[model samples]
Target: MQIFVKTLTGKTITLEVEPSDTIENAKAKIQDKEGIPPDQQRLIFAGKQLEDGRTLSDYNIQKESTLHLVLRLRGG
Candidate 1:
């Protein structure tokens, strides 16, 4: 399945993922494609934070599911 992600900058990226793939795996792929570190990536789907341990299927994510990406803020 493919997931469509929107970044804070309003950029859209398409990620090919399996139903069995964890959110952590998606974060890794996001890091590689978007140059944002996984630790800094805050993934939101359906108004909730996506857990690393949960699989895409666990979230019931479908094709073209929209995921919002927010960058974690560092020290003030």
Candidate 2:
């Protein structure tokens, strides 16, 4: 499946991953392709916060889903 990541910088990175792939896996891929550290990233889909422990399909994330990427905040 193909999913898109929209970053805070207004950049969209398209990734190819399977439904079985974990959110953590996607974060790693984002880091691999864009140099954003996985720990510094947070993904949100359909207003549901995506956590590292869950798979894409667990959130009902289908093909072409656009996941918004926000930089992890420390003190907020």
Candidate 3:
């Protein structure tokens, strides 16, 4: 299945993923394509935060589902 990820900055990227794939795996792909670290990413779907260990199917994610990605911020 394919999903659309929208970043905090309003950037949208399409990712090809399997229903069995974990959210962490999806974050890895986003890191590779968007240069955002997987650990720094917070994925939200249907107004809930997605856990790294959970699979897409676990959340009942459908094709063309839109996920919101928020980047974690750290300051000195």
Candidate 4:
């Protein structure tokens, strides 16, 4: 299946992954495509937080699914 991914940096990346792809896998893809690390990644779908262990399948994602990657900004 193909999924549409959008990053907080306003970049859009498309992924052609299997139906079994997990959120971690998606994060890895995002990292590969956008240069964002998994540890520093924050993904939100439908106003709900997506934790590390969660799978995209758990969220009922299908073809053309678009997930929002909310990158947290931290400084002091």
Best-fitting candidate, scored by TM-score: 1
Q: Which stretches of candidate 2 lie over 4 Å from their true place?
A: 48-57, 73-76
Q: List per-prediction Cα lDDT, in the order shown.
A: 0.77, 0.75, 0.75, 0.71
lDDT of 1 by residue, 1-76 (tens): 6889998678799988886767778889988987777778787775545466664456678888888887887433
Per-prediction CA RMSD (Å)? 3.2, 3.7, 3.1, 3.1
Worst 10 residues of 2 by lDDT: 47-56
Over 2-31, each residue of candidate 3 has an lDDT whose tens digit, in order, gives: 899887678789988876666667788888
Candidate with the larger TM-score of 3 and 4: 3
Ordered list by lDDT, greatest first: 1, 3, 2, 4
Cα distance off (Å), candidate 3, residue 37: 1.0
Per-residue lDDT over 1-76 for candidate 2, one digit per residue giving the tens place of the 0 to 100 score: 6888888778889988875666677788888887777677777775555466664457677788778888875434
Candidate 3 at residue 4, lDDT? Answer: 96
Best by lDDT: 1
